[PDB]
Amino acid sequence: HMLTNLVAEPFAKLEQDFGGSIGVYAMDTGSGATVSYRAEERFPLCSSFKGFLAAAVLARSQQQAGLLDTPIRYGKNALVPWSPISEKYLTTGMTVAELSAAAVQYSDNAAANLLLKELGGPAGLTAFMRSIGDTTFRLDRWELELNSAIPGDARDTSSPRAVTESLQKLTLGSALAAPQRQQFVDWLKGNTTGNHRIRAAVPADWAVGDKTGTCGVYGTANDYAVVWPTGRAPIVLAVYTRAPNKDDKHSEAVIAAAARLALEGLGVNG
Numbered sequence: 001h002m003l004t005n006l007v008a009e010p011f012a013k014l015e016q017d018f019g020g021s022i023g024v025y026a027m028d029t030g031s032g033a034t035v036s037y038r039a040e041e042r043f044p045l046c047s048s049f050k051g052f053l054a055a056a057v058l059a060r061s062q063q064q065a066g067l068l069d070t071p072i073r074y075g076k077n078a079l080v081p082w083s084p085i086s087e088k089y090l091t092t093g094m095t096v097a098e099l100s101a102a103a104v105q106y107s108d109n110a111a112a113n114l115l116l117k118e119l120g121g122p123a124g125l126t127a128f129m130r131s132i133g134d135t136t137f138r139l140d141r142w143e144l145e146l147n148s149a150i151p152g153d154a155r156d157t158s159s160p161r162a163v164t165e166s167l168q169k170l171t172l173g174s175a176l177a178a179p180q181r182q183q184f185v186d187w188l189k190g191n192t193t194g195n196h197r198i199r200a201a202v203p204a205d206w207a208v209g210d211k212t213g214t215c216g217v218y219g220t221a222n223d224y225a226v227v228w229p230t231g232r233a234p235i236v237l238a239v240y241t242r243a244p245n246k247d248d249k250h251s252e253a254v255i256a257a258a259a260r261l262a263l264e265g266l267g268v269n270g
């Protein structure tokens with residue numbers, strides 16, 4: 001509890017300036033030390049479920065060889081706002097692996113819905129999360145309905161701690177086989193949507209993979225990441241926000257500041 005107490009006050013000040021709630025869980029995988037702030041509260045996943053979705057696809061690809069190379073064709077009605085990759089391949093289709101990369105690295109919404117369909121919907125993704133020991137995660141809806149971020153609504157939420165614990169298992173632990181684990185890491189490392197969030201807190205010489213989420217209402221946005229500082233074990237962390245009013249805006253700078261405090265609390269000089 002020592003490290004959590006070290007940063008309790010700056011976290012409270014940060015969220016009060018933000019005007020909402022900030023949830024953080026950070027784990028140093030070397031020492032096992034952790035930093036928590038509102039780490040067991042539920043926050044909306046927004047797009048951050050798409051990382052776990054790709055991991056669930058990779059897990060299935062261990063038993064279904066050729067799943068990743070399977071071409072998926074889709075119609076115009078499958079396109080959803082913020083489908084920047086899949087809209088370019090509407091007339092050709094894309095492979096499951098390409099859809100997974102697009103979902104992770106561009107937060108592509110049509111790609112996410114197509115992969116959800118492959119897995120049996122929100123309950124199928126939830127079942128995968130249960131299979132790795134995550135009893136907190138729940139996905140209930142599809143894009144874009146899952147972004148409603150209604151205060152008090154448990155649908156389409158998890159906790160920062162559960163997100164970090166599941167991310168650790170999938171990227172560093174044994175939840176995925178070694179080739180699939182590295183592919184998941186590589187997709188996270190190539191994300192293009194998180195330059196102003198956890199990455200803004202990480203020195204240029206450290207490797208980082210992340211997945212963002214932005215609900216667009218209720219000041220609700222997030223990012224989770226694995227960070228490989230030089231000379232020490234990797235850090236896994238999750239930063240989630242929400243706010244009381246529908247029109248409250250999220251803040252990427254607040255997410256970056258919260259990540260900085262978490263790393264400072266862990267003693268990670270950065």
Ligand SMILES: O=c1cc(CP(=O)(O)O)c2cc3c(cc2o1)OCO3
Pocket residue numbers: 046047048081082106107109193212213214215216
């Ligand atoms: O700033 C953002 C960033 C994201 C991508 P991510 O942070 O969720 O991953 C975003 C995605 C959207 C959207 C607005 C968004 O605003 O409307 C439909 O899909």
